Design an enzyme around this catalytic site. Sequence first.
Site, PDB file in Angstrom:
ATOM      1  N   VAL A   1       0.818  -1.173   0.000  1.00 58.88           N
ATOM      2  CA  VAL A   1       0.000   0.000   0.000  1.00 58.88           C
ATOM      3  C   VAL A   1       0.876   1.256   0.000  1.00 58.88           C
ATOM      4  CG1 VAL A   1      -0.386  -0.164   2.569  1.00 58.88           C
ATOM      5  CG2 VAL A   1      -2.039   1.096   1.121  1.00 58.88           C
ATOM      6  N   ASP A   2       1.564   1.442  -1.130  1.00 56.13           N
ATOM      7  CA  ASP A   2       2.512   2.556  -1.381  1.00 56.13           C
ATOM      8  C   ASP A   2       3.820   2.430  -0.578  1.00 56.13           C
ATOM      9  OD1 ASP A   2       3.553   5.377  -0.341  1.00 56.13           O
ATOM     10  OD2 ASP A   2       3.040   5.603  -2.438  1.00 56.13           O
TER      11      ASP A   2
END
Length: 81
Positions: free
Chosen positions: A38-39
């Site tokens: 997630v990033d």
Amino acid sequence: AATQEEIVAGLAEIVNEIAGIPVEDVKLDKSFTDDLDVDSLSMVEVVVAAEERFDVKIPDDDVKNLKTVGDATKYILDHQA
């Protein structure tokens, strides 16, 4: 206050905003920083919007020890109001 259904299912909503991971893909056996991805740097922003959602209180110094939403579930439940 929230439930597992708010944490697991809800996180995927937030995760879909932050990164764009499917709105059901943030499951109990799905590790944020492993299977989800997630990033990676923005992950604290997931926390922020999740704190917004469940009304949970999880500072950066606290969240740095999480793994999956399985951990996040019982964790968020104890760290929320």
